[PDB]
Design a protein around this ligand. Structure first.
Ligand SMILES: NCCCc1ccccc1
Ligand SMILES: [Ca+2]
Length: 223
């Protein structure tokens, strides 16, 4: 996250870190046994790390649970990033409390102008690199679909939205991938892609989760 603030330990209790020997992607807990992330975060051998603030320090609220199954969206296209969403089932159910808590799925798509919280452990610099060890947070509005299509000509599908600031300085970034965009207490987006980070007229692009709610519900009902 570029131009954000330190969230505070366990103040984003649905935030997960996907670890394969190192943090590589964020994610969101949607019930005690399922995580949703970006399909471009797909990998074999994922351990899901819950209750995290400092990812390099064991601080006492963590639950490390291995993944038993990953399901990438059946129409994921890695070239266009259309349908960049994946579900991960945990081997055992997480233990839920004020510090590890699931986030609700939306019943409605969020509108342009809605303020949201984006969070993750990704890079904090737009030019160059510095990875935080603690969770960073950013408040950003959902941008109108016309300004989103004007920033990314011929690349925005109906399964994507832009969020952020057309004049740059504040944005999600590498390592924030698969992490949450929560608006009014509902998961609305997944950190998906963008042209660099915090660049002028190149805002973050996010997978539009309200389009996927019935695929998520069906898939967790049968797996
Ligand atoms: N410009 C938006 C943030 C771009 C970023 C998100 C996810 C992965 C890599 C970069
Ligand atoms: Ca830790």
């Amino acid at each position: 996250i570029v131009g954000g603030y330190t969230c505070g330990a366990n103040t984003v209790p649905y935030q997960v870190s996907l670890n394969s020997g190192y943090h590589f992607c964020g994610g969101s807990l949607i019930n005690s046994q399922w995580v949703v992330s970006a399909a471009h975060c797909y990998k074999s051998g994922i351990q899901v790390r819950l209750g995290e603030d400092n990812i390099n320090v064991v601080e006492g609220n963590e639950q490390f649970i291995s993944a038993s199954k990953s399901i990438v969206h059946p129409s994921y296209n890695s070239n266009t990033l259309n349908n960049d969403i994946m579900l991960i089932k945990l081997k055992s159910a997480a233990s839920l409390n004020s510090r590890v808590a699931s986030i609700s799925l939306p019943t409605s798509c969020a509108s342009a102008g809605t303020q949201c919280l984006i969070s993750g452990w990704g890079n904090t610099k737009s030019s160059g690199t510095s990875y935080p060890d603690v969770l960073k947070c950013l408040k950003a509005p959902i941008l109108s679909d016309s300004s989103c299509k004007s920033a990314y000509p011929g690349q925005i599908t109906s399964n994507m939205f832009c969020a952020g600031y057309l004049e740059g300085g504040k944005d999600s970034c590498q390592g924030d991938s698969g992490g949450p965009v929560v608006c009014s207490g509902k998961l609305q987006g997944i950190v998906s892609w963008g042209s660099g980070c915090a660049q002028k007229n190149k805002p973050g692009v996010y997978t539009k989760v309200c389009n996927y709610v019935s695929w998520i519900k069906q898939t967790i009902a049968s797996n």
